[PDB]
Amino acid sequence: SMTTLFSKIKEVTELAAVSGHEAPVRAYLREKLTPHVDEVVTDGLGGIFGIKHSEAVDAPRVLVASHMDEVGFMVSEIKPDGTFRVVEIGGWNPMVVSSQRFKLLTRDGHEIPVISGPAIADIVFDGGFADKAEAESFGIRPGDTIVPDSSAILTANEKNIISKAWDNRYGVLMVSELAEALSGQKLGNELYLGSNVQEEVGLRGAHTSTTKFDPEVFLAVDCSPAGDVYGGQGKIGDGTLIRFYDPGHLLLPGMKDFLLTTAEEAGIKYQYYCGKGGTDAGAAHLKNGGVPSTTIGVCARYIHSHQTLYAMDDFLEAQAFLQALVKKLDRSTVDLIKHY
């Protein structure tokens, strides 16, 4: 049902968690993970993962990870006049930063409204205070996290959603839905399902979770820019992405075979995609003894802004594809992925 999918998306995209401060998103995931998994574990930096044990003898470790954080800003100084100067957390196009609603998140638990009024460090951020003292008197300090404020809404044709943070609440929902869907099932792999911390700042959580859990194979779950509207590639509604290239990662032949095989058998709509940015796979695949990877993905328009536009159908295709992928991963198939 589309009405339900939207509600689920509205919930996850309206949660507020900037890199290094993803407790609200973790709390959400813990509550959705626990009932469908044997064990809930955590890495040093705050990443949560459900372990789903396998009855299979040589069950290979498979890690599936999205990321919990979203792009945002962080207070670097409080001016004497009460305004804030910020540092970007995650990559922002300065063209989109001016005149935007945000929520400043205080250490003592305040949620104070803040707007931006072209270098980021010079952009005025404004909470309507009369001076430094008053701002400070509301619990505000240098280091406080500033999250975009944007509700999720259906587009006129009801096929698409406009919201913030589809990157990467898509992957948060995708991970949640996966746990629900595989609950009854018994897999041929030892499944580690969850979400990374601190991806937006340089794939930081993917270093630590991949190391901690020693997976043989890794599937990132993450969305990327759709350039269809800009004459570039990645077209909304054309399905899940086969990410063969990005500056940090090359899709290996063995993995490519398995992706295309699985997509063909489960009747999945997919499109080839040449990434220009990096996903968690970029860091993960270099960890331990080496971990073949990809990113099970959706594209979306205007990533890293308040107004990301994306297709609901793309999610369904991506979900089914992630389901089929993990179901089919076992001793035989990872050995084949890693046939050297």
Which residues are annotated binding-site positions for Zn(2+)? 67, 167, 199-200, 222, 304
**Least Å distance between CB 84 and a second copy?**
11
Which of 120, 132, 266, 288 is in the footprint of a second copy by CB under 8 A? 288
| Residue 91 binds to a second copy (criterion: CB under 8 A) | no
**Calpha distance 84→42 (Å, rounded):** 34
Binding positions for a second copy, 293-322, rule CB under 8 A: 301-302, 305-307, 309
Per-residue contact flags (x/-) with a second copy for residues 5 to 44, judged by CB under 8 A: --------------xxx-x--x---------------xxx
Please indicate whether residue 111 is annotated as part of the active site. Answer: no
Query: What letters, b where the CB count within 10 A reaches 16 and e where it falls short, cover 107-140?
Result: eeeeebebebeeebeebebbbebeebeebeeeeb
Which residues on neighbouring strands pair with residue 62, listed in sequence order? 191, 217
Q: What tokens appear for 158 in the block?
A: 């009801």
Binds Zn ion by CB under 5 A, chosen from 149, 167, 216, 238: 167
Burial (Cβ within 10 Å: 0-12, 13-18, ≥19) of residue 36: middle
- The interface mask with a second copy, positions 222-261, x = CB under 8 A, is ------xxx--x---x----x-xx--x-xxxx--xx----
Three-state DSSP state, 114: strand
| Residue 115 touches a second copy, criterion: CB under 8 A | yes
Among 216, 222, 246, 330, binds Zn ion (CB under 5 A): 222
Minimum separation from the CB atom of position 58 to a second copy (A): 16
Cα–Cα distance for residue pair 215/290, rounded to 1 Å: 9
Q: In whole angstroms, what is the distance from residue 173 CA to residue 179 CA? A: 10
Strands of the 270-274 sheet, one edge to the other = 249-250, 240-246, 270-274
168 touches, from Zn ion, a second copy, none (C-beta below 5 to 8 Å by class) = Zn ion
First to last CA, the chain: 43
Angle at 309 between CA 94 and CA 285, to 5 degrees: 75
Q: Residue 274 CB, nearest distance to a second copy (Å)?
A: 4
Binding piece for Zn ion, criterion CB under 5 A, among 38-46, 47-55, 141-149, 163-171? 163-171
Binding footprint of Zn ion on the chain (CB under 5 A): 167-168, 200, 222
